[PDB]
Amino acid sequence: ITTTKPIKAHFDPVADLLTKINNARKAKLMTVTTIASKLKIAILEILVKEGYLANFQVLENKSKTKRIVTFNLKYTQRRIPSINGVKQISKPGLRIYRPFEKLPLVLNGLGIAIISTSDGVMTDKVARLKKIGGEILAYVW
Amino acid sequence: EVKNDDLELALKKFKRVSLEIRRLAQRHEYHLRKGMRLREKRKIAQKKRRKFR
Amino acid sequence: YCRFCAIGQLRIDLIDDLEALKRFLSPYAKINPRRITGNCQMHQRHVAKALKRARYLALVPFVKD
Amino acid sequence: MQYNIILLVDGSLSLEQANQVNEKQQQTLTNVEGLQTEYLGLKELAYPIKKQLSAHYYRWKFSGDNQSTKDFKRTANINKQVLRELIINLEREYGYLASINPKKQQLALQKRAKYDEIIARENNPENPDVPVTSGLASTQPRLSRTEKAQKPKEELWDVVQKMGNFD
Amino acid sequence: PVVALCNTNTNPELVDFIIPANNHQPQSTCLLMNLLADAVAEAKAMPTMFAYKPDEEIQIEIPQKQEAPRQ
Amino acid sequence: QIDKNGIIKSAQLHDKDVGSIQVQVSLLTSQIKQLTDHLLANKKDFISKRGLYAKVSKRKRLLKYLKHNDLEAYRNLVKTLNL
RNA sequence: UAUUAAUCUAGAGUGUGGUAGGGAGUUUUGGAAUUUCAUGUGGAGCGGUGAAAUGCGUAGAUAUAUGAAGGAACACCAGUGGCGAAGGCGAAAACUUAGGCCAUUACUGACGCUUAGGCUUGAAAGUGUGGGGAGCAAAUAGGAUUAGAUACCCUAGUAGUCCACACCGUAAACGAUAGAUACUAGCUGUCGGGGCGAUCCCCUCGGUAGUGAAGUUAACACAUUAAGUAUCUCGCCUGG
Ligand SMILES: [Zn+2]
């Protein structure tokens, strides 16, 4: 509420979200802002339910024109972030598609990859549980 | 550059008039490129920055 | 002390303050620099333009008092 | 657009033939009238122009279409009694917005700032004092609401205190 | 460990225990040094000259403390 | 020298629609018409030639965009002599 | 993701107000300075080099004053400045004309980035035709130093440097850093717009600089105008 600042979205949703997280992690920032998109909303939801970041609130103006989402990153009392390294595999013009049997494992399962097969964004381990493959969004560990 | 009243107080000021006339005239007696013209002009401008402030 | 900015002169034409412009002119009919005039960058350009334009009209000398 | 012109005449000649030259030059302009003819009288030249050492400085203040200059410009050079033909046009460096014209307040207050007729002239124009009305009139707001209220959390601090205790 | 009078220009990543006090001014450095000296002194049974002692005290002789700005 | 206010009233569709595609291309055509005369007057005004090329390219791009959404939209806009 | 049918404005444009700038072309105008010539003043040197000599000079030079003609460039203003996409742009005026910044309760409604091929511009040198030629100066001649000097120095000296129409399309055409976008400490200046308002200073949005951490780099170093975190596109590299 009352953000008193103009914010715009960079480019394709996957790349825009990751860069903000990485820069905030490197600069020890805690709060960031970006324009909202249902793909980005879903990936932020699965990220927070995988325990990598704090509160996200999706915000709408006093109209049905613009929707934005702001999300806080998980930290510690000793000021060490939970996010270690983010890398997107999907890329504009380099759409990557692996079957279920070739589903990657990020750092021997320690990390989390976003794989939106048929039911929205959906974690790799529950993907193996449902044995369905598809789009590979990004590696997060 | 006319200025003189009795003997010497104007001569002491003549030295300043001449030095600067000499400095400005010394760059109209040898020819060098326009780029070098600007480069030496900026170099001279740095010199004033260092001392006169 | 750019007294143009201090007063908010806001405009310079030839014959309304020509006596004021003569103060900016050095005794040897030469346009004085910032260190003597005290004008700001914007006004100094205006002063230079006005003095040169007056030089076209022979109101001020060139190489003598 | 506004126009201004300065005339140089043949010096030692009197004033009534100068007015006659003015009237002659009035018709030399195109179909653009509504101009004043206030003049600056006789002033001594700063340097000789062709042979004269003085002349009269004259002025026009008309405004109209761009055709006003060609004929006057070509007839000024040929005439033996015209010396200079400066043509001022609106393209001068200026700005006269109605909201910035009322800076006469700067004039009046600067008059006080220069009032130093007494011995106690401790005032110096180049001296900051930091007064300010500080009418902000600028916030640039952007209202927002809430749509998703995912798992909340509280705040904390990052005060560092290492090793806790010696022994 | 190290404790420092971490004024607003230092780098807190180095100093372990941060004490954001003023040290350029004379009145504050002597005051906090005296509290620390009495803190280590009371552990030695010794009396505390400037610390825990209450009011109408802690008044330190002052090469006067004024004029914070430096050039 | 452009009569910018007048040319709006010609291709304008509503009371206060000044940024429509039709008025933009009308203004671009007027700019091209003026600048062609300016260029033939002064054959060596290179920056003006670059501006002319930029304006004609923008006009072509806007026309191409208009031809993509709806074919029938510019049936009445081809009243201006193009192609 | 791709197609199609639609809606919205935040991307990008158009209009309104504010506004800066050596942005460009065409046509006129001006003063210094040099040269040549004319008129006097005057009598023996001038010129140039580390030193001298070719050269100029009693058929009167250098010097000095006045005047005319002629061509080229526009001191001072001029700066850790302004503009342009790059090359570049600085005496004054007129006409035509390009782009940029700030605020927008206005409008179209994804119309946007990049760009193989293509098109346009593109320092100086050079070339074709017609003019112009004051100064300067490749080639060339002569006087010096050197063993030699076809070089550095000196005295003459044409093409050219100037203008009108074309051609040539190369440079260390350099920020040795392709364009577009989002994010990432801070400090010191300076320039423009805006609000406040005597300047100075308050701050907002922009352009141009210095210092400077995480970060990057082989190091130098870059560091919010990136050589940082990432994406899109083009061009290019694969030992000498
Ligand atoms: Zn000023």
What is the residue-wise DSSP string for F40-66?
Answer: HH-TT-HHHHHHHHHHHHHHHHHHHHH
Chain A residues in contact with D139 by the CB 8 A cut-off are: 4
DSSP-derived letter for residue D151 is S
Q: Tokens at residue F32, please?
A: 């091209």
Residues linked to residue A139 through DSSP beta bridges, in sequence order = A87, A113
Tell me if A32 sits within 8 A of A70, measured CB to CB.
yes
The amino acid at C64: K
How long is the CA A24 to C1' G182 vector, in angstroms? Answer: 13
How long is the CA D54 to C1' G216 vector, in angstroms? Answer: 72
Angle (CA) A46-A48-A51 rounded to 5° is 110
Torsion of CA A42, A48, A50, A51, to 10 degrees: 170
Q: Which of residues 106-145 of D touch A (CB under 8 A)?
A: 139-145
Distances from the Cα of A48 to the Cα of A1, D83, D89, angstroms: 21, 85, 68
Q: Is any Cβ of chain D less than 8 angstroms from the Cβ of E16?
A: yes
Chain A residues in contact with D153 by the CB 8 A cut-off are: 54-55, 72
- Report d(CA F14, CA F12) in Å as an integer: 6
Instruction: Show which positions of strand G are touched by protein (CB under 7 A).
Output: 1, 8-11, 13-26, 28-33, 75-81, 84-86, 89-99, 104, 106-108, 110-112, 119-122, 136, 165-166, 181-185, 190-202, 204, 213-215, 228-233
* Resolution value, angstrom units: 3.7
How long is the CA D48 to C1' G69 vector, in angstroms? Answer: 20
Half-sphere exposure of E48 (CA within 13 A, CB side): 17
Half-sphere exposure of F79 (CA within 13 A, CB side): 8
D125 and C6 within 8 Å at the Cβ level: the answer is yes
Q: Is any Cβ of chain D less than 8 angstroms from the Cβ of A35?
A: no
Closest to D12 measured CA to CA, from D58, D50, D53: D53
- Report d(CA A47, CA A41) in Å as an integer: 10
Q: Number of residue pairs across C and D with CB atoms under 8 Å?
A: 48
For chain B, which chains pass the contact test of at least 3 CB pairs under 8 Å? C
Q: Tokens at residue E65, please?
A: 């403390």
Return all residues near A39 (Cβ < 8 A) that are at least 6 apart: A13, A14, A116, A121
Instruction: Give residue ranges of C with CB < 8 Å to any B CB.
Output: 28, 35, 65
Return all residues near A50 (Cβ < 8 A) that are at least 6 apart: A112, A123
How long is the CA B12 to C1' G151 vector, in angstroms? Answer: 47
For chain C, which chains pass the contact test of at least 3 CB pairs under 8 Å? B, D
- Report d(CA D6, CA D58) in Å as an integer: 5
Chain B residues in contact with C35 by the CB 8 A cut-off are: 52
- Report d(CA A114, CA A121) in Å as an integer: 6
Task: Please report, for chain F, the start and end positions of each structural domain, with discontinuous segments joined by +.
Answer: 1-83
Q: Tokens at residue F5, please?
A: 């206010």
C58 and D8 within 8 Å at the Cβ level: the answer is yes
- Report d(CA C43, CA D48) in Å as an integer: 30
Domain range enclosing D57: 4-88
End-to-end Cα, chain B, rounded Å: 27
- Report d(CA A89, CA A96) in Å as an integer: 7
* A59 Cα–ligand 1 center, Å: 47
CATH number at residue D9: 3.30.70.60
- Report d(CA A84, CA A75) in Å as an integer: 12
- Report d(CA D101, CA D95) in Å as an integer: 9
Measuring alpha carbon to C1', the residue closest to nucleotide G1 is A95
Closest Cα in chain D, distance from residue E6 (Å):
13
Q: Is any Cβ of chain C less than 8 angstroms from the Cβ of B2?
A: yes
How many CB atoms sit inside 10 A of residue E40's CB? Answer: 9
Question: What backbone phi and psi angles, to 5 degrees, belong to A71?
Answer: -140, 135
- Report d(CA E58, CA D93) in Å as an integer: 67
* C4 Cα–ligand 1 center, Å: 5
